């Protein structure tokens, strides 16, 4: 009994095996550091409106996926307080542009775990039973236990949201896709530091018959989402 | 002691530690399947001139990097002949599009190791002592020994070339960057299935003070390349 | 519809979900370099009879598992001909004890891929459709595509054989076990360079209620193996 | 040249004598109440706690000396997320069958669960600021963790292993590090196991084939030959 979501470039998931037990929502880096005033992204001068746009659409998707018993996953980009997991190059680039990782700012130490700006925003806050991944990189798989958690939960399908589209969401999508996870990007549930770059990251997914998976949007997903009993 | 390459958005590498012993050139997927007549990409109708453009610029970079004793790395996307490393979704999408992985075409079985179309093109062919990575995914790190080879060679700096810009080159850049490798993308030594997508993948690198490293071009690299002796 | 194999310290697999589609036999490093005259192990002076002992038991297990449609996996420890994947410490230790990796011997370059001594012995030779893993380390997961192949084949159960019990078989078991694979070591289908060490690697598995899985033997497995429904 | 060696078996460690505070780390593996304390995981399965407490004083001497000479210090804890999302079904089931269920309530709290009293590192070997702690869901410290990433960023080449248990957590971690090219030293008096025979055999496995996983030495030999920083 297969179920499909209207998507581009093909009906998602590819084989219609869409159930709450094999499908997860992943909300990527909806932190004050990426979309709040005083955080990492605001420091570099980027338009916070572009990364706040996805907040309400992700909320509708989260509420619907929570209600139908789907697996829910959240990620935070961040570093250990002693910065032992912070590559030297990553730190130096952040310092040069005036937004140094580990440096004090209005929301505390930029991109440091346990600091106010680093935490997930209240509107999209995790509840009990939802796995949070704390990652030192852009991709959620690198140096984390995400893949191990996904295997133990026997998850085959991943629906990606969050920020930024072209950096954190996209790297995570490519990692999942390479390892065989079947992925759906929701275009209205993500935003980037450059709007052209946001749209191009979406288009990259559609090439070669869906090279990294397929693309849809929050309304199309929620109107066709299956529950536990069919 | 330090050496820099003129790059955008900062002089590369970040700390000027640029030597033949800690720096590698990586040539990504310069295979007939990605830029030849009769292969995977030609099958899907994409403009072969966009992916052939980088051939001569890569050749000039390779000749200069070979001459100064730099580490040279090549990659081929491909699958085991029995297709045991081919995720079901990857295969199905390629079939829908009319360019099925493992299916017979003019250059043999599409994207299958040991087939004519799968091999690296003659102009950029590896010589003895240059490591070739055979990868089942878009990123060169996933399910390969690339990282292990890089650590044994004590390589810190990576200069990326090849195709496609927004798929194979970009995923590999994000993997390397996340693990702390300091990377340089040469914009004239890569090309993609959509030219807009090629330029946007280049621009994505430059954001946030060089989120995935820095960008330059073949001439700027070759004119400022150090040898072992100052 | 559960099936169990009589094993120590518990009936294997834990949950009785034992089928040809989710279970693989893994034959580890049955190469001339580990059990042949003139190879790596014979060079270090070890008793070849200890590592030849498992040949007939593995043959019976392989024939039965091949006949009932089970997944079959083989591994070879070895290095790229240019030795780019050979850590400096590994090489140096092999040279000190007179069995240098890459060095010429009676069966060719020790532990080098493509050389006679490196290949799997004739008695246990792979047939088409059986995945061979070429690994640069002791564990079959490190820097390989084993895990990726396992996931695409939806394999949950692994039955380990080969040499050496305490080095290559054991490392591979611990990697699989950590990632959640349910493993069975067949005690008569493995052997080591020290017989005490072989018996202790078997005992290590049984501790803490089966810390790495369970232990059984070739006869117990073959008489209780489930086949397909015709 | 400016090389330093530690007297070890079967060869002087490290192999190439490149032994400095900046490229060498001490790793203390799973010295948690759950592995060596009263009321924890290991005590639940009936094992002799004296075998796993033996290494406490030797590790203390090695830690004090390595802390004093500016060496990198690493600690690990085996454990699981409170919702048990990182706990394989087989691992859980085996722990339940032998009466020491992971996540189940006991005297020191939920067995092998992060944030619980029994799960934490014992007081005698407690981490100080600037020492990386790895929280791992498996026996090997590399699997599903950021250990390797931290090691690379710190440009660490040499690892000196201590902790428990010798044949399970220490040994798996050694094999992972060794495979990826790290040069490793096991200190035999700074580790202990649930079976003493198994502890001695895990030590012997290291020495085979000219040091298949590295070399073996002991706390006294290490501390008297440890190079310091140049003031
Ligand atoms: Cl200078
Ligand atoms: Cl104390």
Author numbering:
A (entry chain A), B (entry chain D), C (entry chain B): 8 to 237
D (entry chain C): 7 to 237
Reported in the publication:
Excess densityassociated with Cys175, Cys114, Cys190 and Cys196 in the SeMet structure suggests that these residues have tendency to be oxidized. Depending on the structure and the chain, the loop containing residues 44–53 is at least somewhat disordered and has a higher B-factor than most of the rest of the protein. The average B factor for the chains where the loop is mobile (in more than one conformation) is about double that of the average B factor for both the whole of the protein chain and double what is seen for the same loop (44–53) in other chains where there is a single conformation.
Herein, we have described and characterized the structure and catalytic mechanism of BiuH, a cysteine hydrolase that hydrolytically deaminates biuret during cyanuric acid catabolism by R. leguminosarum bv. viciae 3841. BiuH is structurally and mechanistically different from the ‘canonical’ AtzE from Pseudomonas sp. strain ADP, which fulfils the same physiological role; i.e., it liberates a nitrogen atom from the triazine ring and allows further degradation to make all three nitrogen atoms bioavailable.
